[PDB]
Amino acid sequence: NLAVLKLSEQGVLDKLKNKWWYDKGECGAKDSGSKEKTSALSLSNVAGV
Amino acid sequence: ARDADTKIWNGMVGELVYGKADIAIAPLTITLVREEVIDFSKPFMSLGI
Amino acid sequence: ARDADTKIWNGMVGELVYGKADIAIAPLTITLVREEVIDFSKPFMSLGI
């Protein structure tokens, strides 16, 4: 009861949670969600016209 | 969880109720029906369904 | 909080320590040093700075 509060006070829980969830951003959208591609227009875009 | 009609707690619960195991640092959820047989510290990580 | 250099709890925590009160239903933050003089239940509402 006194030890868990020490970890919560000093942010050790935050450091461990960052280590075991956020430092292993692996799959797709987390890494590649903030990038940019320009364009290339294909026919599948313009067909109803 | 407990057994019907015999209250036989299996799993990690009975390991602490029946004097088998000494401590359990594990993903265990504080409920109402678990405080009567074992004791929990202050919670260290929040979540939801 | 405790006073500087005297360890005299003013406020509501002093009302629980010095025998003046009985219970404190209040927006009170579970810190470290408040555990050593009184007792808390499980937390009921979570927040942050």
Ligand SMILES: NS(=O)(=O)c1cc2c(cc1Cl)N[C@H]([C@H]1C[C@H]3C=C[C@@H]1C3)NS2(=O)=O
């Ligand atoms: N952001 S989190 O879920 O990983 C998380 C969750 C919690 C932490 C610390 C972290 Cl890092 N400590 C709190 C404790 C601190 C104090 C206040 C309540 C408890 C005592 N319990 S908690 O609310 O369960």
Ligand SMILES: NS(=O)(=O)c1cc2c(cc1Cl)N[C@H]([C@H]1C[C@H]3C=C[C@@H]1C3)NS2(=O)=O
């Ligand atoms: N979403 S919240 O901050 O208002 C909030 C926060 C908490 C609630 C319930 C609510 Cl609604 N109950 C939990 C307790 C209930 C059970 C499960 C963990 C603890 C035991 N404490 S808590 O994590 O402090």
